[model samples]
Structure formats: C-alpha cells, structure tokens
Target chain A: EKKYIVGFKQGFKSCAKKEDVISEKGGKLQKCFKYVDAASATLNEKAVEELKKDPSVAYVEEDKLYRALSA
Target chain B: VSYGVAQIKAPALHSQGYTGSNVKVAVLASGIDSSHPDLNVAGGASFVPSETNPFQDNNSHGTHVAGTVLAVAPSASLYAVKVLGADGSGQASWIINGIEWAIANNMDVINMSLGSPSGSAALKAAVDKAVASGVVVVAAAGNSGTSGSSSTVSYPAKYPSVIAVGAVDSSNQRAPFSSVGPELDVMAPGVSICSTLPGGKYGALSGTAMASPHVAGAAALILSKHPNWTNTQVRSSLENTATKLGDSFYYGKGLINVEAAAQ
Candidate 1:
C-alpha cells in the first residue's frame, strides 16, 4: 500500500550522514518538501537517493512514521 | 552592497566571539540605568554635571530608547553620555558637547533617541563632522505625525549626514506618534516593540525613538555581512528594501524590513 506524508525538514546535513539540529543560539537551516499524496516504498527510496545526489545535499533518510500495535 | 570593513558578530569572526570584550559606544541621551543587565554592558559619563548615576531612568523614556539600540547591537561597546537632565529636558549646548565627545572618541554609531523642535547651526555642523568622519547617526524624527507632517521633519535629522527615522506599527500603520517629513530617510519597528527596560526588565514600547534603533540594528547586521558597504550604501540598502507599508503622510517610506536587509 502507498502512504502519503507531509513533513518539515531542517538542519545542515553532512554527506552520507544525518545530523540533529541541536541548541545553537537561534535556529537551524534546511529546505522542506511536503507530500500530500500517496507514494510506494520504491518511490520513497528513489526520492531519497535523488536528494542525496545533489551537491549541497549531504545525506538522506525516511521521515518518521506512525505504527499500529496490538496486545 | 560591496566594499569596506564592517562591525560583525564577533563569534563568526574568530574561532570564538570577541565577546565585544571592550567595544566602546557613546549613548547620547537624557540618561540611562547603568545597572540594567542589557545596559550594564553600557558605561556612562554625565554631560549633565549635577546628575548622580547619570544612567538613572528619568520618565523611563530615555531608558527604553537606550536599551533598544543596545539590544539590537549587543556586541558594540556603549558610552552613555547624559546630554539631557533628569527633568527630561536639556540645552542645545549639552547635546552639542556630547556629540563632540562621541566624535572625538571615534564611536562607530551614535544612537540619538531624543530630539528637539528646533536645531542650531552648531548642531548641524557637529553632525556634519560626524558624517564626514564616517560615523552613522540614527535618530528619531520626533513623535509628531498626524497626517499633515509628512513633509515636515525636525532638525539634526534634516541634516544630510543624519539618518532621519520614523515609526510604523506591526500592521503597517504609522505609529500614532511618529514624526513625518520628506527628510525621513527610513522607518523601523516602533509599535509595541520588545526591548530592555529599566531595572533589567524587558517590555514593549512605541515611538520613533524605539524605531530608529531597529534600523541601527539592521545596519549592524548588514555591516557584519557586507563589511565593505559604505555609509551611503548601508542607508541605501535600508531605504531601497524598506517595505512600502503605506502611502499617506502616516506611513513615510514604509516599515524597515530587516529580513530583506539580511539578503
């Protein structure tokens, strides 16, 4: 099944790695892209790869997801 | 937008910030509260002799104005020169001397939050010397705006070397009290602005007095980034990018847009 997500991304990333936005005076810097439509895992993977390919872009990762649980 | 040295964030300059360890600034005003945290960084000398703690808040007016300038340019060293007395009134002679001393010391910027209905040739000449020497002067255009004063501006500001400033509210309305005139070189955040107050507290205040420092702070920011920009260039950046908030005598050139300034 395809899943849709809208998210905010912020930080100065390092290539091949994800860096957390830590407490440093004011605020962090980053570009954000939001998705309001559904997408399959393959598409998500391709998008991540494409983002990582950019020169200024340092790394890529899937955004946080919600999960269901049962007792 | 290009050329010359600038006052920068000390942190960005060195491996660690210079901490503005001893940057000296001259606060030409009625008085200040030297003990206030934001202004404790400020030191004072009374141009008014009978004054004790020339830094003490009188009418809470000068205190608020002093704090805004410092808050915006935190790294600059301050020299609080009490040109006006406790009564919130001062002679032209005192102001003239205070400005002379500030020029003598080579202060980077002179924050004048107060002004008069009249000006003397001597004052204009003194301001000219400061301008010639490359010292930026930020001043209130006076709180006399009503809808008819648009073409009217007070002196010292009327002088070319001085940057005459007006005030605008957040909604982009002219603050009820902002002075107006063609000589008004720029406008800044003046209504309900957050700034340091007497007794080390912070609050919102209005007036062109509060407004001018907003431009001063923006100038410091621009200077930090484009170190080589000339005084004319800095003023231009502010005037050129200023958000055209309104068209009537009430609005002047418009609100000082610092975000646009950062670009």
Candidate 2:
C-alpha cells in the first residue's frame, strides 16, 4: 500500500470530511498535518478511483517525495 | 570571508558603517549553529514538529548558509527557520510552513539555500504571499549544472517571486554544478566557499546553495541603507547594480555588487 495525497476543492469545512469518504471505500485514512486542503492516506486502486469520482476532491496523487537540490 | 564577499565589496560597505543593522534575515534549512560567534542569530523556529531544538545545526548546511549572510553583513540579525531534516531532505509542507512563519513574523529577507525539482503549488502560493507582503526571497538555482542548458532551475527559485541565485567560482565563471535557466537572477562565489560550519568550525562547500546567501546578505545590506525601500526596490536595485556578466540564462543580471547596490 502506498500513501497518497488527496487535494480538496475550495469551500470545504475541513479535510476531515474526506476521512469518511475514503474509509467507506476500505482505504486506510490518516491526518495530513499540512494546513492546505489535503489529506494523506493509504488507498488501493479501487479506492483511488472511487475518490477521484468525488466532486469535492480536486486531485489525487501519490505522495511524491522530493530531495534537497544540492551536490 | 569568501572571495565572493570581497567581489561584491561587502567589506567596503562594512567600512562605510552599513553593516545591515536592524535587518532581519531568515535562513530556512536543516537548522543553525546558534553558538557561532560571528553569527548574531536573533531567533529561530522549526517546521519539523518532531524536532525539539530548532536552533542547533545537526547538519552543517544551514550554518554554512547563515555564515555567508553574516559574512556579508556582520551585524544583520539572523533567524533560523528549520525546514529540512538532518539528511538534507524535507516534505513540501514543511517548507511552506516555514515560509508562512517567516512572512507572519515580518522578516526582511529569507535565504533558501535549498530547492526541489518538483514544484509545489502550496509552496509557490506561500512564496507569492511572502513576496506580496514585502519579504525578499532568495533561493539557490540548484546544483544540476551538469544538465547544462537542457533543464530549468529548481522550484521556489523558479517561482517568479524569488530571486534565484546561481554559482560562480573565484575566477568569475559559472560553477560546474550551478544550475542555469531564465529563473536565475544572479551569480555569486559558491565554489569552495569557506564559512562557518557546525560545532564552532569553518570549512569549504560548493553549490548554488553556497551562492544564494550572498544575494540574501546583499538584499539585507540594501534594506539597511534604504530602510524605506520596498521589496521590489531592493530586488531591482540588486539586479540593476549587479555587474552584468552574461546572458539571462546563465548569469541573470550579473554578479551582485553590494557596494553599487548600497550607493
């Protein structure tokens, strides 16, 4: 299982609402500490597809890691 | 002091008594060596919530960057905003939080000697807000010089709000590892630069990362002289005063000339 970041559309009360959206589809949800309208959780292929269909979700992408830009 | 400091005439400015007094500079990286005598670290904060001591430099990168800023303006007040971890890596959220914190606290200049190729919208938004709020943001162009003209600069630096700094050697040529692109704002001595390290030490490091603080320090120096200058004025003065070296891609305006900027 890989972690994914689900971005929410503007005007949402809280990212907490997405927890039920994912858990209902059998995806393990977790809190996204960042203040942005997003949540991080483990989701299977089906769960990812299900979340993508929701109008509230702006984008769903894997937790892409980044490294320091130095030698 | 590195040759870059002399190249930009920081010593001359210091002699003239414009030592960046009352200027607030924020260095966002791993952490800082608060015990370093030359660095008057005014304050600090850590975006990595797990870290207890944000003022200490578990890694040398942050200290070295801060040293370059202090070298340019010895009296400029420095703030440590730890975003990256000891391993020299961090999530985009941590960096965003650090930038927000810096802006909220009303810092004059922020030196980001760190970058990531993959841009973050949230990070870009934070940078935009900071710039709009009058914070002068300086960032490393990246160390992917070997990629040459094929690739663009790293994010945050690539963002229009930031003044992306490239690296040059003592000979005034672009460093082999300094990234180049249209986003690059200026070049500074980044090759084999000697500055403060962790544990009361000093050493040499090379990368565009080493070059960025020179511009950050220069920005502080400008702000010191013209305390009423807007962020745009400070940035424009640095660009207009720079000794034009080459094209927009490789050198931006040119090597930053602190003396000319203060004048």
Candidate 3:
C-alpha cells in the first residue's frame, strides 16, 4: 500500500536589522531533502522559537512527518 | 507553412532534420529589437500603444528569451508580440489582448517569459482560449525559489492546457528561484546560460525565461519532424525525455532533453 507523503514549506523570520526576512538565508540555495518519517520525532518548539528570535531567522516550519510503504 | 532549408540552423534539432520550416512561433514579451540578428522585422507586433520602439528591448531579459526561442526553432517563423512594457510591467488587459492576438494570428507556439506578482482572470481566459484553439503555450513559473510553494502556480502556466516550465541549475538540479506547485509540468536549464542579445552579441542570463527556450526550441524541433503530432504528443515527448531529479516540485519530469524531443 502507498503511504501518505507530506510536502510542507514555511517562510522563516529573520534577524536582519529588523527588516524583511531574507528569502535565501545564506544567499545560497540549500539542498531539498525527503523525510521518510521524521514527523514522528518529538517536537522542538522551544528550540525553534528560540532560533526564530535570531535576526537572520525569517521564519521556521516545524518538522513534518510522512509515512511511506517503503523507499 | 514552411521555412526554407537554408534558414534552419537549430543545432539541437538539426540532426532530426524535421521539415519544420513553416511552423510559426509567437514570442509574447516586452518589445524586441526588430534589428536583433536573431529576430527578423517580419515576425512581431507592438501591443503596447505608447511604445513606439517595440523592437528595442529596454533590458536584456526580453532579448535573452527571444534569442532562446529563435535558436530552438530556427526554421520556424517567429512573431514577437510586445505585451510587457520596457520596464517589465503590464496590466492584465494588455497581456490578455496579446494572447488573443497570438491566437488570432495562428501562432503554433506561444512563449511567455514574464509574469505578475499574483493571478488574474483575464490571463486565464485568454490562455484557455489559446489552448482550445490548438496552440501550445509555455510560461515561466517564477523566480521566487522553493519558498514559492504557497500554491502559487504562475497564472497561464497554472492553467491545464499550457505547459508550466521551471528552472534548474547547471548540474541538472532545480534552480533555487523556480516556483513549485501541482501545476508544474516540465523544467529546463534556467540557471546562468548564454544566449542572443540586442546588439548582435551574446550574453549570459538565467531564469525559467532561459529555460523555456530550451523546451520551446525542442518543441519546434519536434513539430518540425512530427508535423502531424498533437499537443499531447509533444507534451509526452518532452515529459518522457526528462531525467528524474528526485523532487517533484523542483525538477518535475526532469531536465528537458533536446535530442530525445527531436526523435
């Protein structure tokens, strides 16, 4: 059976002098990775919220999980 | 409905040797320089009433896109319809009017390298009509990168009939600025590439704009060889030729292969 695959994307908050959150965090595009079932991991809301406070953090999306039959 | 043999010079499609001499191409964008070596004076129109010099591109964006299509379908007749003004901004009214004009003129391929910050009904209807009339439409998804995943399928490309093209980097991976969505159909090399310019010279530019020409040229090649093939056939040929990039939104059907398309 095919399992559900979830694709989640979120804009982040940035700490860039209180201006707009930079779209490209490092000015370099990051690799896009697939999560087989990382969503089941414990939520790290405190860490995420803390990171969001940084001027460079545009915004952050919590970890998302998706089930797959088999890779 | 045919171009002469000597006029054909598309390297990607030359090996196929399709008799695409007569296929018509309509490039919908900012005004192109009529004197641009790649674009002949016979193939364009100025949709913007105030723009007297629809032939001269204010920036390199339009020239780059026009040059890409010309390279892909050297034998196919081209028509440049000036929709976006010199500054790259146009109201929904002028953009829709250009599509209708292209349809009425019987352009086989319509390529749009520009887009809006949001969606518009007039744009959708015009694209719908173009597709219904048996024309193939190709458009730039956007340059917003992966963050564009807000279900923001770039208008005309979002429509079912048109082919939505995204961008990829030199290594055959997705470009950071390519917009991703369910409407994404195919992708090509939009990351920095070389192409035609206004002063009879070549320059490097990137975007789905650059990428679209790769497919547009290949589409012209396919049409040249398989003149009787339907739009679906062309779409399948392009899709089947793609190499998977592992991500649906980023690479879609993978990189567009010119040789595969010509065959």
Candidate 4:
C-alpha cells in the first residue's frame, strides 16, 4: 500500500466522513484534513483503482516527500 | 545588518518606525528554537508526528528563516508552525496542516521556505484558502534553476495564490540556483544571507529558502502601513515597485524594494 493524498468531491462535510469512506473502500486513512476535503491514506493498487472510479473521488496522487530549499 | 538585509534596504522602513509592528508572521518549516533569546516567538505548534514540541528546532532551517523575518521586521509577532521534520524534509500533508493552523490562528503573513518540484491539488487548495482568509502567503521559488533559462519554480510557489520569491546576490544578479518561471513573483537577497541558527548561533547560508522570509517580512511592513491590503494588493505593490534586474523569466518582476513597496 502506498500513501496518497485523496481529494474528495464536494458533498462530504467532515473529515471523519472522508476517513470512514476511505476505510470502507479498503484504504487506511493516515491523516484526515480539517479545512479542505482531503486526507492522506495508504492504499493498495486495487483500492486506488476502485476509489478513482468512484464519483466521490477528485484526486489520488501518491504522497511525495519535499525538502527544505537550503544550500 | 548582514549584506542581505542591507540589500533590501530594510532599514529604510525601520528608521521610519515601520518595523512590521504587531503583525503576525508564521514560519512553516522545521520547528523554531523559541528558547533562542534573539527570537521573540509568540507561540507555536508542530505537525511533524515524530516531533511534538514546536519550540524545539532540532533542525536549523526554521530558526534561520524566522531570524530573517525578524531581521527585516523586528517588531512583528512570530509564530512557529513546524511542518518539516528534523531532517528538513516533510510530507505535503504536514504543510497543509500548518497552513490550516496558520489560518485558524489568523496569521497576518505566512513564510514557506520549503517546496516540492511537483504540484498537489490539495496543497493549492490550502494556499488558496490562506489567501482568501486574509493572509499574505510567501514561498521560496525552489533552488532548482538551471544554468540556462528554464522554469523550475516549485509547487506551493507555482500556485497563483502564492507570492513566489527567487534569490539574488549583492550585485542584484539572479543566483544560478534560484528557480525561474512566469509564476515566479519576485527576488530577494538569498546568497550567503546571514541569520539565526539553533542554539543562539548566527550563520550565513544561501538559497531561495533564505530569500522568502525577506518578502514575508516586507509584507508585514506593508501590512503595518495598510492593514486592509489583500494578498493581491501586497503582491502588486511589491512587484510594481520592484527594481527590474532584467529578464522576466530570470528575475520575475525583479528584486523587491521593501521601502518602495511600503509606499
């Protein structure tokens, strides 16, 4: 399972709803968002494909790392 | 003042009594060392799961950025929002969480000295939300510029809502490493820029990261003068009043003139 940030389409009002929805879709929520309707979750390939097919999903990009831009 | 501070002519505003007084600037990076006597950190919170204390800067990045902000706008209230971990790297969610916290706390300005080469829709939404919520968002353009012309501006910085800041040297020349792009907004002194480090130390470093807080501090100065200015107005004033250093791709609108922007 790869960790990904999942953006949900409108209609979900709370982070908990997104978390529960992702969990039911065979993905484990890592961290749910508060202000934005999104969450970082660890999902298998099957879970990712299924979630993207669902109308509730907006985006499902893998969570990538970023570094401090210091020299 | 270091050469970088002098380059921006920050003292022009300081002598005029504008020092970004009472403005709130948030530094989202590795936590800040609140115990450092040189910094007057008002408060902080950490989103890095491994590190729970926001005041403890295990990595020197946040403290360095904070000192630059305070250097340009000494009287501005500083808030530490730790999104990066001790290794000076973090996931996008942590950055998003930090933005969420900054907005909820009503931060006047945000300084993001970190970024990714890729874009995130969620991150863009968060940046957009910060601007709509009345905060001046500033970010580093990334240290990814090529030797020749090429757009390397990073995410969060690439987002239209953010005032992307690239780096320039004392000669007002773009740093070979400073990212360039149409989305890139302005430039600041980031070459060998001197500022605070952890353990109450001072050091000189260079990168677009160091350039960001200068603009953030300058925004605070502008806000101190016109508290009602939106993110768009602050960006416009800084860009419009900038001293063009030539080449839109390389220098954006050019090096920011903090004193001129304040007027």
Using DockQ as the measure, the top candidate is 4
Q: Tell me how each candidate scores on DockQ against the true complex.
A: 0.01, 0.37, 0.01, 0.85
Clash total of candidate 3: 23
Which of 2 and 4 is ahead in TM-score? 4
lDDT of 1 at A22: 15
Chain B only: TM-score of model 3: 0.89
Model 3 bad stretches (over 4 Å): A1-71, B1-12
C-alpha displacement of B120 in model 1, angstroms?
A: 0.8
Q: Estimate, for each residue in A1-71, the C-alpha lDDT of model 2 and write its tens digit.
A: 47676667776536567676677767787654334666667888988998889887777776544445545
State the weakest 10-residue window (summed lDDT) of model 2 chain A: A62-71
Candidate 1 backbone collisions, by pair: A15-A58, B3-B228, B4-B227, B4-B228, B23-B77, B25-B77, B25-B79, B32-B55
Q: How do the residues B183-237 of candidate 3 rate in per-residue lDDT, one tens digit apiece?
A: 7878776766676666766767777777776677667777878888877788788
Ranking by lDDT: 4, 2, 3, 1
Sorted on TM-score, highest at the top, how do the candidates line up?
A: 4, 2, 3, 1
Q: Summarize candidate 2's per-residue lDDT along B1-263 as a digit string, tens digits.
A: 67889987788788888889999999998888876876878888997657756688777898999999989988899999988888887666677768878887889999898887768665676788889989999999888775645656888888999999998888888887778788888888898999998889998988888899999999988888889999999898888888888777788888998888776
TM-score of model 2 (CA atoms): 0.88
> Higher-DockQ candidate among 2 and 3?
2
Give the alpha-carbon lDDT of every model.
Answer: 0.56, 0.82, 0.60, 0.89
Model 2, which residues run further than 4 Å from truth? Answer: A1-8, A13-52, A61-66, A69-71
* Residue B141, model 3, lDDT: 70
